[PDB]
């Protein structure tokens, strides 16, 4: 199928800035490309079709351009109401395919996350599973790397991450990484550490505890 590669995945901006989003086609699609905007809990909304045709009702702020294999969606004089996801789509050939999307967010100064780690608590153990939680609080930008290490052993496939949307007041993010394992495994080891890497930190921050305090 024709693959539409969309960049950037994320883009932070300030009111009035110009936003530029790109979609590259694996093969020529002429000018059969559309651009859409999508906000949480809503269906996509058509912005541009035929690569540069602004759909009825769409603000002059939105301009589509390009042809062949290189397409651009430009949002001049960015407004707060433009904070949303944007997707391109080619309809030159079947199957129709969509770009991976770009989430336009609010720019602010870099802020390092405050890290905290939480033990499973005896109460949960009774369930048979142990949950270890790591918290990255109020950081920016969203890019963050969290690594779990049990007794200095890098974990894989047993953790899940959740991130909040930008705070309405300070525009930061918060993230939780939860390491799930059986009580058996949890009791087998002693050292539990959460190592965090973020643009705002001059070096990785590690928070840890030893089972049984």
């Amino acid at each position: 199928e024709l693959v539409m590669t969309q960049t950037p995945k994320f883009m932070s901006t300030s009111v009035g800035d110009r936003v530029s989003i790109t979609c590259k086609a694996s093969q020529n699609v002429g000018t059969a490309v559309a651009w859409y905007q999508q906000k949480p809990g809503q269906s996509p909304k058509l912005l541009i079709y035929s690569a540069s045709n602004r759909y009825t009702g769409v603000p002059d702020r939105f301009t589509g351009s390009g042809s062949g294999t290189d397409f651009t969606l430009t949002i001049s004089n960015m407004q707060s109401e433009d904070l949303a996801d944007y997707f391109c789509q080619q309809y030159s050939s079947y199957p129709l395919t969509f770009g991976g999307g770009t989430k336009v967010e609010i720019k602010r100064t870099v802020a390092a996350p405050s890290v905290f780690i939480f033990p499973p608590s005896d109460e949960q153990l009774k369930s048979g599973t142990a949950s270890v939680v790591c918290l990255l609080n109020n950081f920016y930008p969203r890019e963050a790397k969290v690594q779990w290490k049990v007794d200095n052993a890098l974990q894989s496939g047993n953790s899940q991450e959740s991130v909040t949307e930008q705070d309405s007041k300070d525009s930061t993010y918060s993230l939780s990484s939860t390491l799930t394992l059986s009580k058996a495994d949890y009791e087998k080891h002693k050292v539990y550490a959460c190592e965090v890497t973020h643009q705002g930190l001059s070096s990785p921050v590690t928070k840890s505890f030893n089972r049984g305090e």
Binding site: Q42, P44, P95
Partner: protein, 216 residues
Amino acid sequence: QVQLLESGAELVKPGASVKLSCKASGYTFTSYWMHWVKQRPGRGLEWIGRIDPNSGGTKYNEKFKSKATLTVDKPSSTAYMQLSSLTSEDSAVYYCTRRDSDYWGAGTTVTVSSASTKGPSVFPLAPSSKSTSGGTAALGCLVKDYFPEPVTVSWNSGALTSGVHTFPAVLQSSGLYSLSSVVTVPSSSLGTQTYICNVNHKPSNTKVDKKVEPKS
């Protein structure tokens, strides 16, 4: 005005099938093709196929060839998409949209799970003791193994809102949901100020109040 009315939300058990609806109005149903699209936060948007309401002719994305079946009912001006033998991979929001994608349905969220209504378990995320004297500590409640959605969390019956972060519910390899709610407070209030998370799970008519304090 043109409108495409979709189901909204469907719960499907693994292996079962579900038929989604998309009722058209405000225009002549048979004059425009109808597209169906799938959306997952990770996979993104995918074109499933299209159907010409006038002829019944269809075209599918190879990826959904054995998964979706598109049909229409002229009398009711409604388009349908049959999704068969579902797995967790099929959980997503499905939309129907007219030929030019100028008009879209609101989307039908499909959740594939074998779980039955179940209230959440609530565990304390205790404040680190003898941690940072920076006057700021973090504590919270781990809300896990509940079904279906949603669950709400407040602190001290709503009196505490500043610094509260309640994370989006994630899915575990069990078919049950889980999430944490945290809050940062003055490291000087610990031991003196009481912190209680109020968890409500309307689906099971279950509510939990849990005091989170330093562990002994």
